[PDB]
């Protein structure tokens, strides 16, 4: 027949590589594109990749997750460790929460960070 890849413009959309065949042609699409002529912008959010109630952004050849507060990572799969800096004073036990921490203060200590000494009273 004809070499559709040699007529002038690339018959493959979105800079796909045109490969000639006898009787037709084929397109080798760049990441994020699909269809016989790469016409379609793939929806990278279609498989629900964003975890923990994150918002998914469908972009060119990728998705981006917008995490709920307290979450991080590409899929918002990481619950940020708020206990990392050891915030509890006087032997308080740190419990990691969502965008927060809890200190389990020993007897005689109170306050968010176990700051208040009550032993003298």
* CB distance 100 to 86 below 8 Å: no
Span of 11-19, 25-33, 86-94, 103-111 interacting with Ca ion by CB under 5 A: 25-33
Q: Is residue 96 a contact residue for Ca ion (CB under 5 A)?
A: yes
Nearer to Ca ion, 81 or 117 (CB): 81
Span of 9-17, 41-49, 84-92, 105-113 interacting with Ca ion by CB under 5 A: 41-49
Beta strands in the chain (DSSP E): 17-21, 24-28, 33-34, 40-41, 55-59, 62-66, 71-72, 78-79, 93-96, 101-104, 109-110, 116-117
Among 13, 26, 39, 41, binds Ca ion (CB under 5 A): 41
**Residue 53 assigned to a binding site:** no
Give CA–CA dist 58/89, Å, rounded: 44
Residues that bind Ca ion (CB under 5 A): 1, 20, 25, 41-42, 58, 79-80, 82, 96
């Amino acid at each position: 027949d004809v070499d559709e890849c040699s007529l002038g413009a690339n018959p493959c959309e979105h800079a796909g590589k045109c490969i000639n065949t006898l009787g037709s042609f084929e397109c080798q699409c760049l990441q994020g594109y699909t269809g016989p002529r790469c016409e379609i912008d793939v929806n990278e959010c279609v498989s629900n990749p964003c975890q923990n109630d994150a918002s998914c952004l469908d972009q060119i050849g990728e998705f981006q997750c917008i995490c709920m507060p307290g979450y991080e990572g590409v899929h918002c799969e990481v619950n940020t460790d708020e206990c990392a800096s050891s915030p509890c004073l006087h032997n308080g036990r740190c419990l990691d929460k969502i965008n927060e921490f809890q200190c389990e203060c020993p007897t005689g200590f109170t306050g968010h960070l176990c700051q208040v000494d009550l032993h003298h009273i």
